[PDB]
């Protein structure tokens, strides 16, 4: 199936980010009934909170106040009928 | 070993181009005697003529114009004492 509305499974996609700036990992899904999980490689799981991380299903994670710990590869994981899938993303500065 | 100086085999870096402006995929080796292969995912080789594309070996393959075929995940790979080596390189647009 395909939980990920773009899908960067093999190769990441590259986002820019710049520091003290809103951050979109644009992982939007196609079901706001997906739950999803944001991955920082290669030890960080990063939980929104709704305030200065949130979700929103048809964007992807919004993060309101980037720094350099959101610079290299994030991931968003989701698990569907059994299965897990990944879309990847590199960010850097811009 | 380490044929790469600098080595992305797991994660590529991202490099900056330039349409019609000069690419250097900076894949320097440890020796002069290394012997580098550039590939494009998924299907091409790019063969060093020593005009539109040159190597030399304290840089990389420098590509004199670099053009729209030019984007993507690039692959510099070298076999040393009968092993494979590979570091990759993702290029998007300044
Ligand atoms: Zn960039």
Same mark, same amino acid.
């Given at each position: 199936? &395909?939980? =990920? @509305?773009? %899908?960067?499974?093999?190769? +990441?996609? !590259? $986002?820019? %980010?710049?520091?003290?700036?809103?951050l @979109? $990992? +644009?992982?939007? @899904?196609?079901? +706001?009934?997906?739950?999803?999980? #944001?991955?920082? =490689? +290669?030890?960080?799981? #990063?939980?929104?909170?709704?305030? &200065?991380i949130?979700?929103?299903? &048809?964007?992807?994670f919004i993060i309101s106040?980037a720094?350099?710990?959101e !610079?290299? #590869?994030?991931?968003?994981?989701?698990? @569907? *009928?059994?299965?897990?899938?990944?879309? *990847?993303?590199?960010?850097?500065?811009?």
């Open positions: 199936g &395909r939980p =990920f @509305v773009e %899908m960067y499974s093999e190769i +990441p996609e !590259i $986002i820019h %980010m710049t520091e003290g700036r809103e @979109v $990992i +644009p992982c939007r @899904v196609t079901s +706001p009934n997906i739950t999803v999980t #944001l991955k920082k =490689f +290669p030890l960080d799981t #990063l939980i929104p909170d709704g305030k &200065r949130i979700w929103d299903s &048809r964007k992807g106040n720094t350099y710990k !610079i290299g #590869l994030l991931t968003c994981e989701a698990t @569907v *009928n059994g299965h897990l899938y990944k879309t *990847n993303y590199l960010t850097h500065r811009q």
